[PDB]
Every structure is written in structure tokens, then in C-alpha cells.
Design a protein around this ligand. Structure first.
Ligand SMILES: Oc1cc(O)cc(/C=C/c2ccc(O)c(O)c2)c1
Length: 274
């Protein structure tokens, strides 16, 4: 699939840089024709077939195809796609409250955690209902619309690892951030929606405690801990946390994906269900 090949600068003015990663940079922009503001994600294309720098066309097209399908209050909205020889440029909904990661750097109550978590679950429920696994859920990929309100609204971003799961599982060596990946990712096993539910359990543990359940001193230790389900609720962090909150996490941090809570289970779990 080919994208708009007019110069993006003919239609948008960029401003503040919002973030950057290994193959991408995100810049605030303003559409000239409407004055409406967006985030422009410039994704570096692979320059040769056998190269390791940049993102392969197949991966870019998969991300774009997924983004075009989704319209939900808790998932980012793709506005337009441009491309040139060097980049594909996603024009994306502007979310100005920063990463949930950075907000957390500023521990939550269970109410504040569940207010965030319920929106994450609603967004993931939407994705999983479309058989979309995100595969990269973590606080860095949860953006807040406005971080200066009591109950910030959030949107899931960064679908660069997301896959349609139309056969129940994908076997592709998808692999995200060690602290958040499920054991099946660590072990290079077939992957499905269940891996997102593990990541939600990790997120929930962090939200409630400010601590990462599997984090080791090195990436290999983290991955080894994940595969061994080597975590515990440290009393120093969880002494005032309800047993039901711990129960929620414990039913997500389950090695066997078939025994892990699904997104529907998580919404019916007594800690979440009204
Ligand atoms: O700091 C910001 C602000 C913003 O408004 C959007 C993003 C990124 C959105 C995004 C959404 C979907 C994707 O697949 C993706 O790679 C990135 C980052």
C-alpha cells in the first residue's frame, strides 16, 4: 500500500518534538488547512532488503493497517499517512498530557490506579474484540490527554508491534520490552491476546507499588525472571493494598496463557467490576 507522497511540509508545520525512539521521532504539528494540531511520527524506512536499520515496509504497513481499523476513545486515532524516500509519516491524534510513565514518576491509590486501569482495559477490550494484540503495552505507550486533571483520560499508542490474531496465535518472534513481555514472548512461543493481559498485570503491579515485578539487574535477568514468574508482592510496597488488587494481578501474571485472565475476565474481576 502506498501513502501520500506530497511533501508533508506543504500541509503541516511541525513544532515541539514529543519523543523519539530507535527508528522514529514524534513532532507536534499543525495542519495548515484546518489549524488542527496532531503528532507527526516519522518512521525511518529500511533502505535495503537485508538491512537492520529502519522499519521494514511489511512492519510499517501492518502498523498502519491496524491503526486505520481502530476508533475508540482509549486508542490513538490515525489522521493521515505520508511517506517519502526516507520516512513514513503517521499524522496521529495529538495527546498532550505526556506518558503515563512520566506521570507515574511524579505510587497511586487503588482508585487512581483503577481509574487508569479501567480505561486501559476498555481500550484493550476494544482491540482484543478486533483480534488485535498490541504486544507492547507498558506505561510509556499510554498517553494522557491532560495530566493536570484529577482523573486523566488515556490513549494507548505505539502499535509498532501490534498484530491481528485471526488464528488464535501468531508465531513470529515478536518481542517488546523485557519488563513487560509475557513468558510466551520470552520463550519464543506462539503468541496471542493473552500476552497483552500479562503486560496489564505488570502495569497494574507498577501502578500500585511504583516497583517493577520482574526487573533484574540486566535484561537477561529480567527475561529469566519473567519466564520463571519470579515476582512477589513486597509487603513494604503492598501492605496497604487490598487483597483483591493483588488477586487481580496474580490472575494475570500466570505463565500458562490458557489459565491467564482474558480481557473479559479482567473486566468482570471483583476489583474492577462496579
Ligand atoms: O508523544 C506522543 C504524542 C502523540 O499525540 C502521539 C504519540 C504517538 C502515537 C502513536 C500512535 C500509534 C502508533 O502506532 C504509534 O507508533 C505512535 C506520541
Amino acid at each position: 500500500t502506498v501513502f501520500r507522497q506530497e511533501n508533508v511540509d506543504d500541509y503541516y508545520d511541525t513544532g515541539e518534538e514529543l519523543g523519539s525512539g530507535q527508528f522514529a521521532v514524534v513532532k507536534k504539528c499543525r495542519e495548515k488547512s484546518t489549524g488542527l494540531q496532531y503528532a507527526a511520527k516519522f518512521i525511518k524506512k529500511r533502505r535495503t532488503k537485508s538491512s537492520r536499520r529502519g522499519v521494514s515496509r511489511e512492519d510499517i504497513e501492518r502498523e498502519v493497517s491496524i491503526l486505520k481499523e481502530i476508533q475508540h476513545p482509549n486508542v490513538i486515532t490515525l489522521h493521515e499517512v505520508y511517506e517519502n524516500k526516507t520516512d513514513v509519516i503517521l499524522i496521529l491524534e495529538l495527546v498532550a498530557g505526556g506518558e503515563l510513565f512520566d506521570f507515574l514518576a511524579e505510587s497511586l491509590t487503588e482508585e487512581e490506579a483503577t481509574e487508569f486501569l479501567k480505561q486501559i482495559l476498555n481500550g484493550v477490550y476494544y482491540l482484543h474484540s478486533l483480534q488485535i494484540a498490541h504486544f507492547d503495552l507498558k506505561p510509556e505507550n499510554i498517553m494522557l490527554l491532560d495530566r493536570n486533571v484529577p482523573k486523566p483520560r488515556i490513549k494507548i499508542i505505539d502499535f509498532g508491534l501490534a498484530h491481528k490474531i485471526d488464528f488464535g496465535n501468531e508465531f513470529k518472534n515478536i518481542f517488546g520490552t523485557p519488563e513487560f513481555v509475557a513468558p510466551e514472548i520470552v520463550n519464543y512461543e506462539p503468541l496471542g491476546l493473552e500476552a497483552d493481559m500479562w503486560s496489564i498485570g505488570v502495569i497494574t503491579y507498577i501502578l500500585l507499588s511504583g516497583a517493577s515485578p520482574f526487573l533484574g539487574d540486566t535484561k537477561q535477568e529480567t527475561l529469566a525472571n519473567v519466564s520463571a514468574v519470579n515476582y512477589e508482592f513486597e509487603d513494604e510496597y503492598f501492605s496497604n493494598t487490598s487483597a483483591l488488587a493483588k488477586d487481580f494481578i496474580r490472575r494475570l501474571l500466570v505463565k500458562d496463557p490458557k489459565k491467564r485472565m482474558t480481557i473479559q475476565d479482567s473486566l468482570q474481576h471483583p476489583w474492577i467490576k462496579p
